[PDB]
Amino acid sequence: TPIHISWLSLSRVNCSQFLGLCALPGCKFKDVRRNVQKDTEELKSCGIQDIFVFCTRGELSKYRVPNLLDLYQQCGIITHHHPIADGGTPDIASCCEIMEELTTCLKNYRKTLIHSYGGLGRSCLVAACLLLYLSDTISPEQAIDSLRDLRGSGAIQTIKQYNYLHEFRDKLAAHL
């Protein structure tokens, strides 16, 4: 099979663009045997221009895709690797850099895709953060609902992540 991308509409934050989310491309784990090169080519063939990866180095090793980043760039895709702990959250400085690189991809009209291990939690956390980021009217609860509607009730994984969403605005406000 291909690799499925779940496209998030950003119209709720006044944006014509869509943001793509997915699970680990080329992942090879129990019962899951993907072809990292075919997947890459597929994404490339789809028009993907920029890809954000939140999987750590260890994971890329575990799931036998250590040169994931390599392959993406070999295919002409700009790769944004910002490791976030499985079940964890990004510090404010890193999450801030992610928001900025994402916003730029959109303002440039770049077909953008983001992924974690299972595209459910770390990825939804960043996606939901981007909604709060681009809108000052949407609630954490609402941003969570939008991703829940896209990824399922398991959109956000841990209460640590829920906790980050609530107050992400305040933590981000903390700007010296």
Structure token pair of residue 155? 């959109």
Q: Beta partners for 124?
A: none
Distances (CA, A) of 79 to 60, 64, 93, 146: 14, 18, 19, 26
Q: Give the list of residues 6+ apart from residue 45 with CB closer than 8 angstroms, or none.
A: none
Instruction: Identify which of 124, 161, 123, 135 has the alpha carbon closest to the alpha carbon of residue 10.
Output: 135
Q: Beta partners for 80?
A: 52
Method for this entry: X-ray
**C-alpha 90, offset from chain centre:** 12
Resolution (A): 2.0
Decide if 56 contacts 83 (C-beta within 8 A): yes
Decide if 114 contacts 52 (C-beta within 8 A): yes
CATH superfamily for 1-176 is Protein tyrosine phosphatase superfamily (3.90.190.10)
> b/e for 14-37, b at 16 or more Cβ within 10 A?
ebebebbbbbbbbbeeeeeebebe
Domain ranges (residues) in the chain = 1-176
* CA pair distance 66, 108, nearest whole angstrom: 30
* CA pair distance 98, 47, nearest whole angstrom: 21
> b/e for 114-135, b at 16 or more Cβ within 10 A?
bbbbbbbbbbbbbbbbbbbbbb
CB atoms under 10 Å from CB of 46, counted, come to 14
* CA pair distance 93, 97, nearest whole angstrom: 6
